């Protein structure tokens, strides 16, 4: 991921790191994850890089994914099922879809999905 211009997500860059790692944790948990569209725009490259490591599959890839997602077990699933599931796709692991804007802020919502 190149950085983002403009104000980083959540609060500052640290909260953006935490947001991204949380969104990727729950993405590699459920596969289908709804956020607001700018969160998904920030997370799509980030998650696709993590899954690149997943389909690499070695202790260095595990140790460089655990440097983002603290959780040992969602990453067990990453380097167990989600990883090999992309035995073919070179790039293009996630997919954004448009949901209707959240009432209360009209925040453009989007559901990001592991391709399958």
Contacting residues toward RNA, per CB under 7 A: 1-3, 10-11, 14-15, 18-19, 21-23, 25-26, 29-30, 32-36, 39, 44-45, 48-49, 52, 59-60, 63-64, 70-71, 89-96, 98, 102-105, 107, 111, 115
Q: Which of residues 52-111 bind other proteins (CB under 8 A)?
A: 97-101, 103, 106, 111
| Residue with Cβ nearer other proteins (88 or 100) | 100
Pairing mode of beta strands 94-98, 32-36: unpaired
Q: Are 104 and 77 in contact (CB under 8 A)?
A: no
Task: Name which of 85, 74, 75 is nearest 115 in CA terms.
Answer: 85
């Amino acid at each position: 991921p190149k950085p983002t211009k403009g104000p980083r997500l959540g609060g500052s860059s640290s909260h953006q790191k935490a947001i991204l790692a949380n969104l990727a944790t729950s993405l590699f948990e459920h596969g289908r994850i709804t956020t607001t569209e700018p969160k998904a725009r920030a997370l799509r490259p980030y998650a696709e890089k993590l899954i690149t490591h997943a389909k690499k599959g070695a202790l260095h890839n595990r140790r460089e994914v655990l440097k983002k997602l603290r959780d040992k077990d969602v990453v067990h699933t990453l380097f167990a099922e989600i990883g090999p599931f992309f035995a073919d796709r070179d790039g293009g692991y996630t997919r954004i879809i448009k949901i209707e804007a959240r009432k209360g802020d009209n925040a453009p919502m989007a559901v990001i999905e592991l391709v399958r």
